[PDB]
Amino acid sequence: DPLLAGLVSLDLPLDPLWEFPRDRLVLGKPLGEGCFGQVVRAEAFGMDQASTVAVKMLKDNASDKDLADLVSEMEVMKLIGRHKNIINLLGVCTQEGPLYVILECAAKGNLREFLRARRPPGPLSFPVLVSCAYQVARGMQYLESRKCIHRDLAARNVLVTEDNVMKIADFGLAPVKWMAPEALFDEVYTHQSDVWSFGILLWEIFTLGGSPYPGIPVEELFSLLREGHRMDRPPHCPPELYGLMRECWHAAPSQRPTFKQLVEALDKVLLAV
Numbered sequence: 001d002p003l004l005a006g007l008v009s010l011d012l013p014l015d016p017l018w019e020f021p022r023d024r025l026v027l028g029k030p031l032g033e034g035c036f037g038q039v040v041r042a043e044a045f046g047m048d049q050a051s052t053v054a055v056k057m058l059k060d061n062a063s064d065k066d067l068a069d070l071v072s073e074m075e076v077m078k079l080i081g082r083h084k085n086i087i088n089l090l091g092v093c094t095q096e097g098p099l100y101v102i103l104e105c106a107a108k109g110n111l112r113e114f115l116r117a118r119r120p121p122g123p124l125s126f127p128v129l130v131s132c133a134y135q136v137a138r139g140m141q142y143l144e145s146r147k148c149i150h151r152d153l154a155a156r157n158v159l160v161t162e163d164n165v166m167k168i169a170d171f172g173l174a175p176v177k178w179m180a181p182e183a184l185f186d187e188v189y190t191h192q193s194d195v196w197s198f199g200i201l202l203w204e205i206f207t208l209g210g211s212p213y214p215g216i217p218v219e220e221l222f223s224l225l226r227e228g229h230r231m232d233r234p235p236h237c238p239p240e241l242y243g244l245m246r247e248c249w250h251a252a253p254s255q256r257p258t259f260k261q262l263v264e265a266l267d268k269v270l271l272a273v
């Protein structure tokens with residue numbers, strides 16, 4: 001792997017809007033189980049006040065493709081822009097040292113685990129659940145407005161911060177049970193196919209981290225979905241919210257709600273409470 005083995009220095013372009021002082025950063029201990037590279041928790045100063053951040057770097061046996069993938073993710077996060085309900089880029093270190101990508105840390109893990117850990121034998125009341133859904137919908141609406149199609153929206157890909165804020169994660173910037181039929185069939189991915197996945201995420205939320213389509217082998221799902229199968233209402237779910245889910249799972253992409261509508265609908269339920 002030429003670039004990494006051959007170059008005693010890696011001449012990435014300086015981008016002053018994002019470059020971050022290496023001596024204002026302090027690397028701590030691994031974050032997660034690194035299914036997505038070596039990711040480390042860290043403290044970052046003057047973002048003279050410290051704050052906890054996450055830092056991604058190359059694994060010490062990274063290939064040139066690993067380098068390209070990290071750089072690609074980096075560049076994509078630059079263009080997306082800031083929103084409260086997504087994991088934001090906070091900075092980069094590219095000049096005169098190892099490549100570091102600095103981003104928001106979510107201390108409480110992903111949304112699926114968060115819910116499962118707090119299952120009753122309350123903490124996960126109707127308002128808390130609607131609020132989770134609402135936040136994600138706001139995140140997706142923002143992403144949509146930036147012309148970004150997620151393609152893998154699921155509770156396992158939503159992260160929870162210290163203050164219980166939902167932040168959409170995206171490990172695909174460089175599964176089947178969450179894919180719209182048109183994506184399963186023709187590898188067509190749209191905002192409306194994200195809406196389908198959001199419906200599945202909604203079901204995930206109200207079953208408190210339940211696994212979609214229980215007892216159904218992934219190979220059977222397409223004929224099942226073609227023949228019109230849909231998941232049933234979760235016990236913790238008002239008919240009206242289930243109605244939303246089912247609209248997200250409309251066969252025709254045009255008959256699924258938009259994320260703007262999902263935000264407004266979920267917002268109204270929140271006020272009502």
Ligand SMILES: *CCC(=O)Nc1ccc(CN(C(=O)Nc2c(Cl)c(OC)cc(OC)c2Cl)c2cc(Nc3ccc(N4CCN(C)CC4)cc3)ncn2)cc1
Nearest residue numbers: 031032033034035039054056073087104105106109169170
């Ligand atoms: C295979 C299981 C696994 O290892 N999952 C896992 C998920 C998330 C992380 C680390 N985070 C992360 O990668 N963020 C990130 C990065 Cl580095 C980039 O870089 C390009 C892009 C994007 O999206 C654009 C994102 Cl999100 C991460 C984690 C956290 N907090 C956090 C803490 C703990 C856990 N956790 C603990 C225990 N289990 C079992 C699962 C998960 C998850 C997340 N905040 C921010 N980013 C690493 C591994």
